[PDB]
């Protein structure tokens, strides 16, 4: 009956990377991944969390961290098209049109 | 040749030795001695 707990990681490819690829870290960069993996989905059961990650280099992240059950929904946020631009330009000039600060020519 | 990039370091501390309680014990004991001398 518990509520939801949300954790928002950021630049998730700064700590998580393919294991064994990096060298000279003194080991601190190869046990963090193990701890995170064991904690997201371990022998005990958790059913009230939600983890969000965002990054600019999708393919560097560890492969064992992306199978279904840990980070299922993968999405790409690409550039817009003409309709997308007409929409985006129509959100940022809403206030100006409200108080008649925007001329009738534009 | 191949010049090593450099290096990075890790740390592992150790317990400290305050050894400050013994001073309070010694002060208390000296007070013991003073009172004991006066009582006689």
Q: How far is CA A17 from the centre of its chain?
A: 15
Q: Is B2 on the interface with A (CB under 8 A)?
A: no
From chain A, the residues in CB contact with B12 under 8 A are: none
Q: Do A26 and B10 touch (CB under 8 A)?
A: yes
Q: Which among A68, A52, A53, A47 is positioned nearest to A4, based on CA atoms?
A: A47
Q: Please tell me the distance from the alpha carbon of residue A53 to that of residue A60, in angstroms, as a whole number.
A: 14
Experimental method: cryo-EM
Q: Please tell me the distance from the alpha carbon of residue A49 to that of residue A6, in angstroms, as a whole number.
A: 6
**What is the distance between the terminal CA atoms of chain A, rounded to a whole angstrom?**
54
Q: Please tell me the distance from the alpha carbon of residue A63 to that of residue A76, in angstroms, as a whole number.
A: 17
Question: How many other β-carbons are positioned within 10 Å of the β-carbon of residue A62?
Answer: 15
Q: Do A27 and B9 touch (CB under 8 A)?
A: no
Q: Which among A18, A57, A56 is positioned nearest to A37, based on CA atoms?
A: A18
- With CA atoms as reference, the chain B residue closest to A27 would be B10
How buried is A36 (Cβ within 10 angstroms: 0-12 exposed, 13-18 middle, 19+ buried)? middle
From chain A, the residues in CB contact with B10 under 8 A are: 26-28
How buried is A66 (Cβ within 10 angstroms: 0-12 exposed, 13-18 middle, 19+ buried)? middle
3-state class (DSSP) for residue A51? strand
Q: Is B8 on the interface with A (CB under 8 A)?
A: yes
Q: Please tell me the distance from the alpha carbon of residue A34 to that of residue A27, in angstroms, as a whole number.
A: 11
Q: For residues A24 and B5, is the Cβ–Cβ distance under 8 A?
A: yes
For an interface test with B, which of A23, A25, A26 has the most B Cβ atoms less than 10 Å from its Cβ? A26
What single DSSP character describes residue B8? -
How buried is A9 (Cβ within 10 angstroms: 0-12 exposed, 13-18 middle, 19+ buried)? middle
């Amino acid at each position: 009956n518990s509520g939801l707990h949300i954790i928002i990681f950021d630049e998730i490819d700064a700590i998580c990377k393919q294991r064994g690829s990096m060298a000279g870290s003194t080991g601190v960069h190869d046990t963090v991944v193990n701890q995170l993996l064991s904690k997201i989905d371990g022998v005990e059961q958790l059913n009230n969390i939600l983890v969000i990650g965002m990054t600019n280099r999708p393919d560097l992240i560890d492969e064992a961290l992306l199978r279904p059950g840990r980070l299922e929904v993968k999405m790409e946020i690409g550039l817009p098209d003409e309709k997308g631009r007409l929409q985006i330009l129509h959100i940022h000039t809403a206030r100006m049109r409200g108080h008649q600060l925007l001329s009738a020519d534009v | 040749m191949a010049e090593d990039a450099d290096m990075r370091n890790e740390l592992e501390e150790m317990q400290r030795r305050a050894d400050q309680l013994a001073d309070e014990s010694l002060e208390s004991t000296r007070r013991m001695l003073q009172l004991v001398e006066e009582s006689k």
